[PDB]
DNA sequence: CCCGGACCTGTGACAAATTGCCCTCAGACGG
DNA sequence: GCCGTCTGAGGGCAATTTGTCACAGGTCCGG
């Protein structure tokens, strides 16, 4: 009975770089906006702690540092670039934060759409594994299975992977294998994949999955 | 031919970053 | 009105994970 996140495919497939803590906050903003026109959201420390099973102290640390790391962050929809925030965050009351999302982002948030319950993702740690799990949901069938081929260059561009993952053996070891292992251990999805080649170069990854 | 060279793979090392933990002390509130 | 408790805003930590690069070791091309 946990919150059902839905988002436009354009966000699933946008180019940006966010941490886990920021992505966690981002799911609730999308939830708040959708339940309504101006872009102003709010986060309560004690509620965040209860959702993600943290203490109040570590929640406060997570929100505060996440919040100041949004500055200068930009989002690209393929292209068009936007800042996420147009005013610094601020706290009117103790245990409470108020934030100002770029109102021009509203239409990008909200029948080409992606949807998942928040409990599916709340134990994932690596933000790239959150990105991969969202793109797979975009292709999921009602029953819970799907199959899709993602191109390696597009993965690198959209998820803004760091430069050393342009060497394929590092791509495998520190991104692909790790995020496939997390999904299989931390979500209800059971995931497999295979590599597509052209000559000596590996060009796509083909993902298949079913539901537990 | 065999060479040096341009590709590809995986692993061992080390540097940089993130994780859940731990401790202090004042704010807000109610009994 | 004061004070005890529930909060959360600060300061830190060591153990793991993520990001980078050298080197070993495969193939095929062409002079
Ligand atoms: Mg933290
Ligand atoms: Mg080649
Ligand atoms: Mg040997
Ligand atoms: Mg050699």
Question: What are the residue boundaries of the structural domains of chain A, listed by start?
Answer: 1-122, 123-212
CB A100 within 8 A of CB A29: no
Hey, what long-range contacts does A153-157 have (CB within 8 A, 24 or more apart)?
A: A155/A205, A157/A15
Query: Which ligand is in closest contact with the Cα of A200?
Result: 2
Protein contacts of strand C with Cβ less than 7 Å away: A 44-46, 49, 56-57, 60-61, 63-64, 91, 94-95, 125-126, 128, 162-165, 167, 169-170, 173-175, 178
Q: A95: left (phi > 0), else alpha (psi -120 to 50), else beta?
A: left
Nucleotides of C under 7 A from a protein CB: 7-12, 17-22
Q: How far is residue A173's CA from residue A156's CA, in Å, rounded to a whole number?
A: 15
Residues A7, A135: contact at Cβ < 8 Å? no
d(CA A139, CA A171): 23
Question: What are the helix (H) ranges across A69-205?
Answer: 106-109, 127-137, 152-158, 168-171, 177-186
Structural determination approach: X-ray
| Separation of first and last alpha carbons in chain A | 18
Return the closest-CA partner of residue A120 out of A102, A105, A100, A140.
A140
Query: What is the whole-number distance in angstroms between the Cα of residue A169 and the centre of ligand 3?
Result: 20
Please choose, from the candidates A104, A107, A114, the residue with its C-alpha nearest in 3D space to the C-alpha of residue A5.
Answer: A114
Locate A5 and state its tokens. 């996140």
Which residues have Cβ atoms closer than 7 angstroms to strand B?
A 19-21, 57-58, 61, 94, 125, 167-170, 172-173, 200-202
- Reported resolution, Å: 3.1
Is residue A123 within 8 A of residue A191, CB to CB? The reply is no
**How is residue A88 written in tokens?**
């610094």
Looking at the DSSP assignment, which residues form a beta bridge with residue A44? A96
Contacts 24+ apart (CB under 8 A), A40-45: A40/A98, A40/A99, A40/A100, A40/A101, A41/A98, A41/A99, A41/A101, A42/A96, A42/A97, A42/A98, A42/A99, A43/A96, A43/A97, A43/A99, A44/A95, A44/A96, A45/A95, A45/A96, A45/A97
Q: How many CA atoms lie within 13 A of A7 on its CB side?
A: 26
CB A209 within 8 A of CB A145: yes
């Amino acid at each position: 009975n946990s919150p059902r996140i839905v988002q436009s495919n354009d966000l699933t497939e946008a180019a940006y770089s966010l941490s886990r803590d920021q992505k966690r906050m981002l799911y609730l903003f999308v939830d708040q906006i959708r339940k309504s026109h101006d872009g102003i959201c709010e986060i309560h420390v004690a509620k965040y702690a209860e959702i993600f099973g943290l203490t109040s102290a570590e929640a406060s640390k997570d929100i505060r540092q996440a919040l100041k790391s949004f500055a200068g962050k930009e989002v690209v929809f393929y292209y068009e670039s936007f800042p996420w925030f147009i005013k610094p965050a601020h706290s009117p009351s103790r245990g409470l934060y108020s934030v100002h999302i770029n109102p021009y982002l509203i239409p990008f948030f909200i029948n080409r759409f992606t949807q998942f319950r928040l409990s599916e993702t709340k134990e994932i740690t690596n933000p790239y594994a959150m990105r991969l799990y969202e793109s797979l949901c975009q292709y999921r069938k009602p029953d819970g299975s799907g199959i899709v081929s993602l191109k390696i260059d597009w993965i690198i561009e959209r998820y803004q992977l760091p430069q050393s993952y342009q060497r394929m053996p590092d791509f495998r070891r520190r991104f692909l294998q790790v995020c496939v292992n997390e999904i299989n251990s931390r979500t209800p999805m059971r995931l497999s994949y295979i590599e597509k080649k052209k000559g000596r170069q590996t060009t796509h990854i083909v993902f298949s999955f079913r539901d537990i």
